[PDB]
Amino acid sequence: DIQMIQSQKFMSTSVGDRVTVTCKASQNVGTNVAWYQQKPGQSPNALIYSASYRYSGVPDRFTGSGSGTDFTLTITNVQSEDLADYFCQQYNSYPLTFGTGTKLDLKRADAAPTVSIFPPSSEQLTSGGASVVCFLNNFYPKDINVKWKIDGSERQNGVLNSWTDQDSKDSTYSMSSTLTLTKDEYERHNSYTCEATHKTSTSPIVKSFNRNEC
Amino acid sequence: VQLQQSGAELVKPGASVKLSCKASGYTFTNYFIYWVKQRPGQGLEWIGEINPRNGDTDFNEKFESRATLTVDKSSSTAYMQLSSLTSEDSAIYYCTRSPYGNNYGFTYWGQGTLVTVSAAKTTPPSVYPLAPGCGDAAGSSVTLGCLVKGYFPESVTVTWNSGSLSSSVHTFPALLQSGLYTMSSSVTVPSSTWPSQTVTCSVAHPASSTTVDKKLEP
Amino acid sequence: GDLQCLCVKTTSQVRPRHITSLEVIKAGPHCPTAQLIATLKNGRKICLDLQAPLYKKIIKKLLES
Amino acid sequence: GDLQCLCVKTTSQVRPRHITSLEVIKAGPHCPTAQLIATLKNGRKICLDLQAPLYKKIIKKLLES
């Protein structure tokens, strides 16, 4: 066990930037280094070996550097496809050691969260509960706050949200506002509105539905 | 596929879990096999290697006891049991390969198998349709979702119409709700023609083996 | 993706003045990595290491008789 | 105990015209199968079968010079 110190773990750059994944060795390995590419929610693909020699079918953009205890991974031109994760390796002493990882984000056209209102499921009246969701997608940055409006008031009984890892074609996150309310309190109230305060618009964008008719 | 893998599942602390791995070609007997688990929070850790010809290994000293490798020349097969779990064994396992036998990085990997430690109450997946209707619905691209909550164990995948518009796909992570999980998904689709075409979200949960696909209309 | 690599493991013992050819097969559609096969005096094919200045030094011992 | 076989797939279908050189390697210690590689006229290598009597078909066509 040696460990490979990765100084940067969370980075972000534009379309066509030179990036340097910092990876320094605790003890000497001697050129026996490897860089990988972990696709979001996919197996790490073989990138390059010995901080110089590239594998079969690897684009010219990738370039390794340094030897011994100091190594560096550089990249010339980046595309929407090149957005992923990159890891560090050493192979000279068993047990063989990895690292931590260094993610990246591509900078492009900034978006406003296109929110849609969704009435609770028709099966929710045959199970015991409520499911009010406002799906928001394509926005920047990942930092947003969820607010609600019911009959003028608000509830925060069980609003559980989750952010997606940005798509490899638009580079924008998506959040879902899941509710876990009861049946009785739900039926009593009428108007249902979900508020989303963000930098994209001064006033929180909402979408409301009436209990009447629907 | 050359390096397939087993199904994803969870088990109780202090137990045993047996994995599987197959290969294709002579690129088995000569090449050294490796096993690694992905946290994925902290990072990657090495378990050990194993010669296919002989049987000689060389595990990691920190995770030696929580390891057991038996390679069978049956059909290029490689198994791994786990000697007593804890709670940190919550990591997705891989069955990797290397091009120069036991050195020069890690070429082939594989799909993987997700393993967690908790042993809570098992629950089949709950699927609920989420469509507009009655409101406005008018626009250029009306997006829709399908809620898949209240399930156990993990491993879940939902696909809309087998892939009608794969551009800007959405996959909302699981949330631990009441000893179970809460998952959701959506996709983008033009409002050019909606009241005509049929759309069904195909829900998979191989951990408990259940499939529910519901029709969507306003 | 039929044909595959022609090497397995590196060799420790290296005899600078006992070799003839050095087939340096670069990465291709077949083998995902480069190759350094040498032919011995007796005709025995072996693989070598890339990283280390093996060849950097071996060349001389081949070129200077 | 290094040096892996070059072939993984047998194959039989091929053009008897578009080819350059062919060789057969004996079942050595490093490679147990009967190797039969042939260098393509375009710059690639392909393998063949033992009991498939189509290897002879091409040999003859090359001596016609």
Residue numbers in the entry:
A (entry chain L): 26 to 239
B (entry chain H): 1 to 218
C (entry chain B), D (entry chain D): 6 to 70
Q: What does the report in the manuscript say about this coordinate set?
A:
HIT is caused by antibodies to complexes that form between platelet factor 4 (PF4) released from activated platelets and heparin or cellular glycosaminoglycans (GAGs). Here we describe and compare the crystal structures of PF4 in complex with Fabs derived from KKO and RTO and the structure of PF4 in complex with a heparin-mimic pentasaccharide, fondaparinux. NMR studies reveal that PF4 exists as an equilibrium among monomers, dimers and tetramers. Each monomer contains three-stranded antiparallel β-sheets on which an aperiodic N-terminal domain and an amphipathic C-terminal α-helix are folded.
KKO recapitulates the salient features of HIT in a mouse model in vivo and competes with human platelet activating anti-PF4/heparin antibodies in vitro826. The KKO-Fab fragment binds to the PF4 tetramer by making contacts with three monomers (for example, chains A, B and D within one PF4 tetramer, Fig. 2b, surface representations; Fig. 2c, detail of KKO epitope on the PF4 tetramer surface). Further analysis revealed that PF4 within the PF4/KKO-Fab complex adopts a symmetric tetrameric structure, which is an ‘open'-‘open', possibly intermediate, conformation. This result enabled us to superimpose the PF4/KKO-Fab complex onto the PF4/heparin complex model to build a structural model of the KKO-Fab/PF4/‘heparin' ternary complex. In this model, the polysaccharide binds to the ‘closed' end of PF4, stabilizing the PF4 tetramer, which orients the ‘open' end for recognition by KKO. In the third step, HIT-like antibody KKO recognizes the stabilized ‘open' end of the PF4 tetramers, further promoting formation of the pathogenic ternary complex. Pathogenic antibodies that act like KKO and preferentially recognize the tetrameric species display greater avidity in the presence of heparin, which approximates epitopes, and in turn the bound antibody fosters oligomerization.
